[PDB]
Amino acid sequence: SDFGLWSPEQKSVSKHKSSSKIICCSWTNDGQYLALGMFNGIISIRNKNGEEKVKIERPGGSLSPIWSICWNPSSRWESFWMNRENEDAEDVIVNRYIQE
Amino acid sequence: RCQIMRHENDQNPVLIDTGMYVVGIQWNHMGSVLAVAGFQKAAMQDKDVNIVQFYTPFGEHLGTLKVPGKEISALSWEGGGLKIALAVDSFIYFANIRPNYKWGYCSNTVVYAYTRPDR
Numbered sequence: 074s075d076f077g078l079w080s081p082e083q084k085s086v087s088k089h090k091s092s093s094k095i096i097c098c099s100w101t102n103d104g105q106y107l108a109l110g111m112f113n114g115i116i117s118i119r120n121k122n123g124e125e126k127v128k129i130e131r132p133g134g135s136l137s138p139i140w141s142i143c144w145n146p147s148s149r150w151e152s153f154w155m156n157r158e159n160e161d162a163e164d165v166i167v168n169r170y171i172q173e
Numbered sequence: 174r175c176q177i178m179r180h181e182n183d184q185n186p187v188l189i190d191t192g193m194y195v196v197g198i199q200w201n202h203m204g205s206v207l208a209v210a211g212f213q214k215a216a217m218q219d220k221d222v223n224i225v226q227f228y229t230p231f232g233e234h235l236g237t238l239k240v241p242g243k244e245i246s247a248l249s250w251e252g253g254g255l256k257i258a259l260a261v262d263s264f265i266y267f268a269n270i271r272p273n274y275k276w277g278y279c280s281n282t283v284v285y286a287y288t289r290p291d292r
Contacts, residue, residue: 158185 110139
């Protein structure tokens with residue numbers, strides 16, 4: 074029922090609500106919308122803050138569960154993060170919890 | 174400090190310490206030279222001298238040009254890349270500049286080479 078967005082090492086998570094079982098999820102190629110597919114045969118489109126902007130229903134509804142979806146990689150952003158040569162990593166004593 | 178990237182989130186860019194107080198930077202029209210305008214503390218004085226330092230895109234130092242006046246304010250290349258205008262203390266100087274072209278002459282053929290907009 075619920076999908077839990079958060080950005081790196083902030084102290085909280087947006088446990089935001091859904092109409093239906095949320096089977097599969099995929100970010101837009103520019104990062105600005107998270108699109109969700111539902112067991113109810115609907116795909117819906119949510120912005121990076123979690124507001125819902127667009128819906129499509131497959132004619133038949135829950136007859137046709139959406140078991141996976143994928144945004145096409147074909148835009149300028151695919152080389153973004155394709156230039157790294159960092160030689161070291163983060164390290165921590167013991168595993169923490171993130172609240173709410 | 175200066176930093177030259179391949180794209181807006183290149184996390185392994187070219188790193189440069191110019192060793193001077195920088196006021197501004199400009200590529201030449203062909204993108205083959207970066208000019209850096211600034212001033213450096215003079216070697217025997219509590220006084221600053223105006224300099225332009227020229228760099229390759231890969232951060233190798235091509236040369237240094239001094240200019241007379243209180244401060245260099247700003248920097249800009251001619252559209253042909255054969256002059257650079259230096260705004261300094263109510264004057265504009267113009268440095269002539271003689272490119273190190275990829276060229277040579279052999280048996281009454283001239284060989285000249287250039288980068289292209291479309292290759």
